Design an enzyme around this catalytic site. Structure first.
Site, short mmCIF file in Angstrom:
data_model
loop_
_atom_site.label_atom_id
_atom_site.label_comp_id
_atom_site.label_asym_id
_atom_site.label_seq_id
_atom_site.Cartn_x
_atom_site.Cartn_y
_atom_site.Cartn_z
N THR A 18 0.82 -1.22 0.00
CA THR A 18 0.00 0.00 0.00
C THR A 18 0.85 1.26 0.00
OG1 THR A 18 -1.85 -1.22 0.94
CG2 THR A 18 -1.97 1.16 1.19
N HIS A 77 -4.28 -11.00 1.98
CA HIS A 77 -3.92 -12.12 1.12
C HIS A 77 -5.14 -12.78 0.51
CE1 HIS A 77 -2.98 -16.56 0.76
NE2 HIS A 77 -2.12 -16.00 -0.07
N1 LIG Z 1 10.95 1.71 7.03
C1 LIG Z 1 10.06 1.44 6.07
N2 LIG Z 1 8.81 1.05 6.39
C2 LIG Z 1 8.00 0.82 5.34
C3 LIG Z 1 8.35 0.94 4.00
N3 LIG Z 1 7.28 0.63 3.19
C4 LIG Z 1 6.34 0.36 4.04
N4 LIG Z 1 6.68 0.45 5.36
C5 LIG Z 1 5.85 0.18 6.55
O1 LIG Z 1 5.48 -1.20 6.58
C6 LIG Z 1 4.16 -1.36 7.12
C7 LIG Z 1 3.39 -2.18 6.08
O2 LIG Z 1 3.22 -1.34 4.92
P1 LIG Z 1 1.92 -1.53 3.97
O3 LIG Z 1 2.06 -0.66 2.77
O4 LIG Z 1 0.68 -1.40 4.77
O5 LIG Z 1 2.15 -3.08 3.65
P2 LIG Z 1 1.12 -3.98 2.77
O6 LIG Z 1 0.54 -4.91 3.83
O7 LIG Z 1 2.07 -4.78 1.88
O8 LIG Z 1 0.21 -3.10 2.11
C8 LIG Z 1 3.68 0.06 7.42
O9 LIG Z 1 4.11 0.43 8.74
C9 LIG Z 1 4.53 0.94 6.47
O10 LIG Z 1 4.70 2.30 6.90
C10 LIG Z 1 9.69 1.33 3.66
O11 LIG Z 1 10.15 1.52 2.56
N5 LIG Z 1 10.51 1.57 4.77
MG LIG Z 2 -1.75 -2.91 1.91
#
Ligand SMILES: Nc1nc2c(ncn2[C@@H]2O[C@H](COP(=O)(O)OP(=O)(O)O)[C@@H](O)[C@H]2O)c(=O)[nH]1
Ligand SMILES: [Mg+2]
Length: 386
Positions: A18, A77
């Protein structure tokens, strides 16, 4: 206008799908123009329904200098499993997000595996969270693992674009990390080819109805799913019974008499020398020698939970439901995978099916699993067997 490309983020929970989707829209808006979208708007995905299934999917749009993307991102998922099996989406390419902090995880493998089963044609990787890892040796090892995982499921792992970046710092405005988003958008443009247009594919029209008309003709009606049918051209009537050959002697739309029918139009196709009783429900019109009738296939299926209106009871190897292909139900018997003997509502499995009547099909054809005309499952043909 600009070529339209369907893409989406795939990958394990919390790897940052996301955050990346919002970074892409935001960086692209600031660099090429358009509207940024924030994390919270994409994360809060709406519900949608079709083929009788409920999926939480966010739809975002963004542009590169030469293309327009419709991008799908989903909260869980299970959402991905449902969307990949149906075709709520129908990705011309996916962005696999792999957090460098964790390396590939179980859902990383499952999304790749399903991508292949359902025929997602290209996968690009965004190795995320590189702001958390210094170690280049570790980044290199994670990349090698992903490439190997990709090649295990037949994707060209060695040639796959992998961008090292930070969706989070890009989202936050750090130019150095924003540059990696722009690199990713460059690979969406250069690595995913322009999708073939329906109009350029071999003619195909699922027959919805049939009428005995005026002089001696039978007309079959339906939507032109692919290609074009021109007056004077030959067609195969494929499915259900032995294939027959006929010639299109007329194409009409309401009171308009046309010289051809094109992809996306609802027409009546006048058939020479075919009587109304030679036409069966489930049949298609196609350009000759372009699609074959099959009865046996391997598929990936999602079974609706009781909650979604699916069965309330599990099924076993003896299950003999109806498989609804385009326009009609066809009963089939199933073969369950190694290990499995009980399939619970809410489950998704690979299922081998044998229909009692042949249906014109190729890999990727979608179907509904029905019970007394009620949708209880959804599937995609992964591999035609006979
Ligand atoms: N340090 C860091 N945290 C990240 C990064 N990308 C995502 N996050 C964190 O990882 C968590 C999961 O991100 P999200 O986009 O919701 O993951 P999704 O479940 O794959 O959609 C959240 O706390 C984000 O802020 C990144 O590049 N660096
Ligand atoms: Mg997500």
């Amino acid at each position: 206008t600009k070529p339209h490309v369907n893409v989406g983020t795939i990958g394990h929970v919390d790897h940052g799908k996301t955050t990346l989707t919002a970074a892409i829209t935001t960086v692209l808006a600031k660099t090429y123009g358009g509207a940024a979208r924030a994390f919270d708007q994409i994360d809060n995905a709406p519900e949608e329904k079709a083929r009788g299934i409920t999926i939480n999917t966010s739809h975002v749009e963004y542009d590169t200098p030469t293309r327009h993307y419709a991008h799908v991102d989903c909260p869980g998922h299970a959402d991905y499993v449902k969307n990949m099996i149906t075709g709520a989406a129908q990705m011309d390419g996916a962005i696999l997000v792999v957090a460098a902090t964790d390396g590939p995880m179980p859902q990383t493998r499952e999304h790749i595996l399903l991508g292949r089963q359902v025929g997602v044609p290209y996968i690009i990787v965004f190795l995320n969270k590189c702001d958390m890892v210094d170690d280049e040796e570790l980044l290199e090892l994670v990349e090698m693992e992903v490439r190997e995982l990709l090649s295990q499921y037949d994707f060209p792992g060695d040639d796959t674009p992998i961008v090292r970046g930070s969706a989070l710092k890009a989202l936050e405005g750090d130019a150095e990390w924003e540059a990696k988003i722009l690199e990713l958008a460059g690979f969406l443009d250069s690595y995913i080819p322009e999708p073939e247009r329906a109009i350029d594919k071999p003619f195909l029209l699922p027959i919805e109805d049939v009428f005995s008309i005026s002089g001696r003709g039978t007309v079959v009606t339906g939507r032109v799913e692919r290609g074009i049918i021109k007056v004077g051209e030959e067609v195969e009537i494929v499915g259900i019974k032995e294939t027959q050959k006929s010639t299109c002697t007329g194409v009409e739309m309401f009171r308009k008499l046309l010289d051809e029918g094109r992809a996306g139009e609802n027409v009546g196709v006048l058939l020479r020398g075919i009587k109304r009783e030679e036409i069966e429900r489930g049949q298609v019109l196609a350009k000759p020698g372009t699609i074959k009738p099959h009865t046996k296939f391997e598929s990936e299926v999602y079974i609706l939970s009781k909650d979604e209106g699916g069965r309330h009871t599990p099924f076993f190897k003896g299950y003999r439901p109806q498989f609804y292909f385009r326009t009609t139900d066809v009963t089939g018997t199933i073969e369950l995978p190694e290990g499995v003997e009980m399939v619970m509502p809410g489950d998704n499995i690979k299922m081998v099916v044998t229909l009692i009547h042949p249906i014109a099909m190729d890999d990727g054809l979608r179907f509904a699993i029905r019970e007394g005309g009620r949708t209880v499952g959804a599937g995609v043909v992964a591999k035609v067997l006979s």
